[PDB]
């Protein structure tokens, strides 16, 4: 849309459910102990999206400052680990992504800038991560009961699947979502570095939306050990230039095991306000590869 | 600071400090019926931050994005004036700004990355607006002697200066911050052009904190007229380009009179920490003039 035309919407009812939801997940979080940490936008280095089945290998929106040059956060995911690396222990931030993806993925969740809630704990297991997300989305979902006057899934814990028999069952994520009637976890998707690789068996878990509406929560245990790490970068044809001060941490031996997500703050307001695409909750689009008008 | 010495580097109290800020300042609003709204940090307007006597003129950092080429976010002054132009009220945000100014800024709360929580109101007054952040200072304080053990500024009678009389009497007003042991107000600062102007008269104020930690928090009530704002950017030397579909907006009569700030929320744990440098505070510095390593 153009300027005038995206500022005559009225999305008030979005915005107070996303002021609802934000209230919420962030208490949820103070209330367990959790450090709220601010973001960083621009750093050396960031999140590479590959290999990822879910990407098709985009490159980050890059600028130079005082000469050098940074890249726009694709995700905290390197900058989370370091939060550990510092003592935190259990951290989040409300942390804007920016990933310029294209035309082919704007499929009514993807935004080119959202915010993900995004948190770690140390030591952390898939399990516990895994529970604690149930935790969140069964209060959030009893909570938009109370806000919408509509009826939610009420599962307080979410069936399992491998990547791998999605693939045989539903032939895709987004084939399952469309079958399903309420939350689901994809796990063991071979995909980043970061994630933790343990014997062909990666320790990660995407959460799921019901009736299409894909996935909203993405996240994994985490490598720590310097070779591993720099193994595996190399073998998907990445380049530990990108990585270098990270890789300097890692090779001190000062990345502790931890696992942790991100969970689409945007996408959780679409699915509660149960809109056909994302900008529709959204004051200012950020439709995959069409660049914003404001 | 190489990055091992970077997150080798003790902040947990600073972070302990933060996150008790963010929860009270944040429920502050939510409290108070504003609507949480979510970051921009690419688009193609951005706050001028010209003319200011606080500035250094700098022009905002730029990214193509499908083609396009974007500003990153200096501040979102004119997004938060598109959200009250689309009804919403009262709305603050969580919001990152990158201003890459120059070493001769690096003077203790200047981050060329940092976060602001950021607030507008529709038909509020400047007399409101500082009136709201008395408020909350207020009670911030308050809540900080509780948390620290130490004594914070009474925080209930707060002097207003005149910006030519901050420059007659202390010359800066860093100057006037060093002579202080209570927090202040600077108002009517000729400035950027979304800044109301009546009558010679700039309806604009900035909180300045004692004891030499300077400005915490800026706003003013706003332009909201066509041809008001089109007579200041001329006259600046700015581009109306530069402004298109804000203008647009504008030129429909959809923009609406309100008034709001930014308040620093690393400033305010820097001030609560008690730490002489910003930088001390926080898990990444950005530093003003030195590209971070992570």
Redesign the interface.
Known sequence: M???EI??????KA??I??KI??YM??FF?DRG????????????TDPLWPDPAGEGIRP????????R?R?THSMIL?KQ??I????EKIFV?S?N?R?ESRRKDDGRHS????QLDFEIEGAKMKDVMRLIEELIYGLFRKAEEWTGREFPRARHFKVYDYKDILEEFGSDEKASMEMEEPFWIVNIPREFYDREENGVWKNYDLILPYGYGEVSSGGEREWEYEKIVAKIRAAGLKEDSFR??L??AR?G?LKPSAGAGIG??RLVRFIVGAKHIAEVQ??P?VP??????
Do not use: C
Request: net charge negative.
């Open positions: 153009n300027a005038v500022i005559s919407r009225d999305i008030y915005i107070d996303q002021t934000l209230d962030t208490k103070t959790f450090k709220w940490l601010l973001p960083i936008m621009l750093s050396p280095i929106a890059e600028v130079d400052v005082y000469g050098v940074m726009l900058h370091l939060a690396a510092m003592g935190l409300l804007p920016i310029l080119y800038e959202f915010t001060p990270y300097e941490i001190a000062k703050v945007e004051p200012f950020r590869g069409i660049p914003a008008v404001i």
